[PDB]
């Protein structure tokens, strides 16, 4: 495609496999995943299942503004911050900066996709991409802004959307 | 060498800050208590000005370390950070920095006591002091961290501490 | 995936900048070369326009996996007074545009008469368009003066004289 | 009241002692001093001797807004930096210096001036005293006398004789 990258769940799985394999190759097995809410939710859960990482914590950030930090002490822990895309890099910057104030043993970052203009390059990523990424978990947000985007099941979504608006 | 405020002096420190907040027309929407030294000051200030929303940040101080941040969204709120003493000023700096990341409408700071060398001056404080302060709520910590500390009820404390050490895991 | 300019093209890029400078009636009193990618462009531009005053700024923008910060870092500024001078900042590529932005910001504190910027190549996503540039390019550029860094850091890099480079790199390892 | 504050060298030493004591108590021992040239020259050297700080670097800046002429330093990355000047009047100079030094990505930049005026836009992190009138320092007293020869400083007669010889040979 030319404007959009619309990864299948199959590709999302392979992105996570790719980051997992790179973590193992680097010998960086995090003690704690910090999922960036809410784009990093699904990548962090899949990565957790893949590598059997039992400790996931969360930071609610909107873009960046912190709304909440859901974690206990990280002192002396190896942390991996997980997001779905690093576009401007501002989110990873803000999250790295605040997590560093918890004095972890180490902070590394991971994002499934990287834009070529990001001010922060994740330690781990699957693909650098210069198109707008429509993820399986924000496809309806994208459709609500632009109905033309070429995603599956749009008809069923649009029927539901119309019923919602009637409320 | 020590300044050892009575609880009566602590009450007057809180009144002074509450009076300053009202004079300045800065009535915060949210108090952020610096744990654990800011606990008592924040509760007393909250009681005094009927400030119903208190949130908390667990920070310990060669650098301040954040252990947890106990708060919901602060966006668009007027926040007042509350601690008991600003000494190096590193704690207020660290807390102000992280709270600013929550995009509050405003952040101001308060400490009961200020040391004259602090790297961060609070917006509100009661007294500038150059002695080490023994607070009523950390007097036993000061006893445990020093050789010979002149506080009331020390002999009752030491008898209890002796028994605590005898049975500790 | 790479744009790999010949030295012939680099010369033409510098000509193109010099031609644009003259067309804009902006003949710099001082070139500020961004070290170290702007070194060779600034020297060639100086020879072309007979600009005798080149000064330097050591600035890096770490954007690698493992070596990453959000902003460029100045290490040193090699210049004396620029007050009242027309300055041109010269670099080889503007990618994010942060480097040109940072250098412009610091040079402005020297109260020049004017600061303008030039880069041989511009990426489509730069935050600001340099005042002068040769071409907008979206491929990763391999310059003649950082081709061996690219070879050391990336796989399957197709550059001329790679044979001679790897032979030397082999010898370097034996004494490193 | 008095027109000028005219500190003795004894007072300048005490100002430097005061700042040095505050640096130690506040847990900020600098890795590098950045002396603002040329008023911060003598304060920085005295502070360096007091605290045994071996790394002094320099910035040539003059003050509509401050103008940097040169920055005499190598990499400051990861270092604790203290900027040192003699007086903060508008605060524009410390603002400009802090701004450029921050671009060197130090671990931290803090500022110090011996004296602070109340209308400064920037309050230095460390200072000795607040003053709300003109200060004549031991190191710029002759510049002041050249503007107004009535200012009450010592050794003025010797200076004026020298100054008269200088005015000739031009
Ligand atoms: O679905 C997205 N695809 C992208 O390529 C992309 N690039 C940037 N963003 C933004 O990331 C922020 C995360 O907090 C959101 O505001 C998105 O607009 C993106 N969202
Ligand atoms: O009891 C204290 N007295 C002080 O003067 C003082 N200055 C700094 N501190 C630190 O502040 C914490 C409580 O807010 C203490 O545990 C000290 O680390 C002080 N604690
Ligand atoms: O060889 C490069 N090609 C590029 O397309 C490119 N885009 C950005 N950079 C950065 O600019 C410096 C040289 O001025 C390099 O060291 C990269 O950090 C590039 N380097
Ligand atoms: O001797 C000075 N006394 C002042 O009160 C004062 N206020 C501002 N300045 C400026 O600071 C420079 C020395 O650091 C002087 O040359 C004045 O420009 C002052 N210089």
* DSSP line for C95-126: SSSHHHHHHHHHHHTT--SEEEEEEEEE-TT-
Question: By the 8 A CB rule, do A147 and A50 touch?
Answer: no
Angle at CA of residue A27, ends A24 and A30, nearest 5°: 85
- E-assigned strand segments in D66-107: 67-72, 80-88
Q: Do D27 and B62 touch (CB under 8 A)?
A: yes
Burial of residue C173 (CB within 10 Å: 0-12, 13-18, 19+) is: exposed
Residue of D nearest to C55 (CA): D70
For C1-176, CATH number out of 3.40.50.2020, 3.30.70.2740, 1.10.20.10, 3.90.25.10 equals 3.40.50.2020
Residue B134 in contact with residue B3, Cβ under 8 Å? yes
Contact (Cβ atoms closer than 8 angstroms) between residue C5 and residue C150: no
Beta bridge partners of B57: B34, B69
Alpha helix locations (H) across chain A? 9-25, 41-51, 90-100, 139-145, 154-165
Question: Which residue has a Cα nearest atom 11 of ligand 2?
Answer: B85
Atom 3 in ligand 1: which residue has the minimum CA distance? A133
Pairing of strands A65-70, A56-62: antiparallel
Q: Is B101 left (phi over 0), alpha (psi -120 to 50) or beta?
A: alpha
Pocket test for ligand 4, best of D43, D112, D134 (most atoms within 8 A of CB): D134
Maximum distance among all alpha carbons in chain C? 54
Q: Are D36 and D88 in contact, with CB atoms under 8 Å apart?
A: no
The answer to whether the CB atoms of A71 and B72 lie below 8 A apart is no
As given in the structure block, the two tokens for residue D10 are 């004894």
Query: Which conformational region is residue A141 in: left (phi greater than 0), alpha (psi within -120 to 50 degrees), or beta?
Result: alpha
Domain ranges within chain D, ordered by starting residue: 1-170
Q: Which of C72, A54, D139, A101 is nearest to B61 (CA)?
A: A101
Q: Indicate the pairing of strand B65-70 with strand B54-60.
A: antiparallel
**Mutation for D interface: B119, B123, B129, B131, most D CBs within 10 A:** B119
How many Å apart are CA C52 and CA C59, to the nearest integer? Answer: 22
Q: Residue B118 has which token pair? A: 């602090």
Instruction: Quote the crossing angle between the two packed helices C7-23 and C39-49, to the nearest 10°.
Output: 60
* Ligand 2 atom at shortest distance from the alpha carbon of B134: 1
Q: What is the DSSP letter of A129?
A: -
Q: Domain B1-169, CATH 3.40.50.2020 — does that match?
A: yes
Pairing of strands D4-5, D134-135: parallel
Distances (CA, A) of B20 to A9, B45, B79, B124: 58, 12, 15, 7
**How far apart are alpha carbons A26 and A29 in whole angstroms?**
9
How far does the centroid of ligand 3 lie from the alpha carbon of residue C150, in Å? Answer: 10
The answer on whether C66 is annotated among ligand-binding residues is: no
Residues 6+ apart with CB under 8 A from B30: B53, B54, B55, B71, B74, B77, B78, B79, B80, B104
CA-based end-to-end distance of chain B: 36
Beta-bridged to residue C64, according to DSSP, are C67
Instruction: Look at the block and give the residue holding tokens 């919901």.
Output: B72
Domain A1-167: CATH architecture, name and number where available: 3-Layer(aba) Sandwich (3.40)
The answer to whether the Cβ–Cβ distance between D25 and B119 falls below 8 Å is no
Nearest to D73 among C76, C102, C110 (CB): C76
* CB of B85 closer than 8 Å to CB of B113: yes
- Omega within 30 of 0 (cis) for the link into C36: yes
Structure tokens at C25: 């009636």
Non-local CB neighbours of A7 within 8 Å, separated by 6+ positions: A15, A133, A135, A136
> Is B8 a known ligand-binding residue?
no
CA distance A153 to A157: 6
C29: Cβ contacts below 8 Å, ≥ 6 apart: C53, C85, C86, C87, C113
**CA atoms of B17 and B28, how far apart (whole Å):** 12
Q: What is the resolution of this structure in A?
A: 1.7
The CATH-assigned architecture of domain D1-170 is: 3-Layer(aba) Sandwich (3.40)
Contact A81, A34 (CB under 8 A): yes
State the helix-helix crossing angle for D41-51 and D9-25, rounded to 10 degrees: 50
Chain B residue numbers touching A101 (CB-CB < 8 A): 64-66, 94, 97-98
| Closest of A124, A113, A116, A118 to residue A85, by C-alpha | A113
| C169 to B44, C37, C145: CA distances (angstroms) | 70, 22, 17
Spatial separation of the C-alpha atoms in residues B53 and B59, rounded to whole Å: 19
**Determination technique for this entry:** X-ray
Q: Which of A93, A115, A121 sits opposite C64 (nearest CB)?
A: A121
CB C110 within 8 A of CB C83: yes
Question: Is the shortest distance between the CB of B135 and ligand 2 below 6 Å?
Answer: yes
| C65/A119 touch (CB, cutoff 8 Å), yes or no | no
* DSSP annotation of A75: T
Bridge partners (DSSP) listed for residue D85: D113
Identify the residue whose tokens are 């200088």.
Answer: D166
From residue A156, give the alpha-carbon distance in Å to each of A8, A18, A166, B135. 18, 33, 16, 65
Q: Which residues of C3-16 are buried (b: 16+ CB within 10 A; e: fewer)?
A: ebbeeeebeebbee
Q: By CA distance, what is B114's nearest residue in D?
A: D26
Helix axes B7-24, B39-49, angle to 10 degrees: 60
- Interface contacts (C, D; CB < 8 Å): 44
Measured between CA atoms, how close is A89 to chain C, in angstroms? 8
Question: What SS3 state is found at A156?
Answer: helix
């Amino acid at each position: 495609m030319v404007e959009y990258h619309i990864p299948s769940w199959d590709e999302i799985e392979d992105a996570v496999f790719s980051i997992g394999e790179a973590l193992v190759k680097s010998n960086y097995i995090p003690d704690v995943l910090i999922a960036v809410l809410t784009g990093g939710i699904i990548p962090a859960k899949l990565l957790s299942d893949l590598l059997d990482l039992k400790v996931i914590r969360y930071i609610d950030i909107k873009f960046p503004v912190i709304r909440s930090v859901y974690t206990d002490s990280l002192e002396g822990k190896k942390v991996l911050v997980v997001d779905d895309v690093a576009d401007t890099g501002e989110t990873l910057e803000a999250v790295s900066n605040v997590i560093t104030m918890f004095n972890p043993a180490k902070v590394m970052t991971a994002a499934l996709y990287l834009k070529p203009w990001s001010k922060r390059i994740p330690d781990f990523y699957y693909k650098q991409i210069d198109k707008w990424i429509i993820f399986p978990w924000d496809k309806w947000d994208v459709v609500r802004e632009n109905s033309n985007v070429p995603v599956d099941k749009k008809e069923r979504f649009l029927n539901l959307y119309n019923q919602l608006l009637k409320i």
